[PDB]
UniProtKB/TrEMBL annotation:
Protein name from the UniProt record: RNA polymerase sigma factor RpoD
Region called Sigma-70 factor domain-2, residue ranges: 1-43
Assembly information from the UniProt record: Interacts transiently with the RNA polymerase catalytic core.
Record-annotated RNA polymerase sigma-70 domain positions: 1-10
Entry's family note: Belongs to the sigma-70 factor family. RpoD/SigA subfamily.
Subcellular location: Cytoplasm
Function: Sigma factors are initiation factors that promote the attachment of RNA polymerase to specific initiation sites and are then released. This sigma factor is the primary sigma factor during exponential growth.
Length: 52
DNA sequence: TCTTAAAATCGAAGTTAATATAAACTACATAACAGACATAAGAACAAGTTACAGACGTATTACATAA
């Protein structure tokens, strides 16, 4: 899931902004891990809003 | 031909009843819930249509009375 996060982060990276890649990629990989663990870690799915 | 790691097995009942750690905001579309209306289905009353019952009235016969 974090790997998918990297692919999506690379697809929309901007180096005009001058920040390093790790800072932007960490956020997207965080989102990947959290969304996947909210959607697929239970036998009975609990919607994302109820997860938060 | 000789090690060496794997693979498989190891009695019946009986009873037994589980746990417990570890992003937020925003935007949009969809489903659900409630209310009102129209419709189809049933309940109620009343009427009409029809034949039969129940006792009366009639018709018939036989006995009694009158000539």
């Amino acid at each position: 899931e974090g790997n998918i996060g990297l692919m999506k982060a690379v697809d929309k990276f901007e180096y005009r902004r001058g920040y390093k890649f790790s800072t932007y990629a960490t956020w997207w990989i965080r989102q990947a891990i959290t969304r996947s663990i909210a959607d697929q870690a239970r036998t009975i799915r609990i919607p994302v809003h109820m997860i938060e």
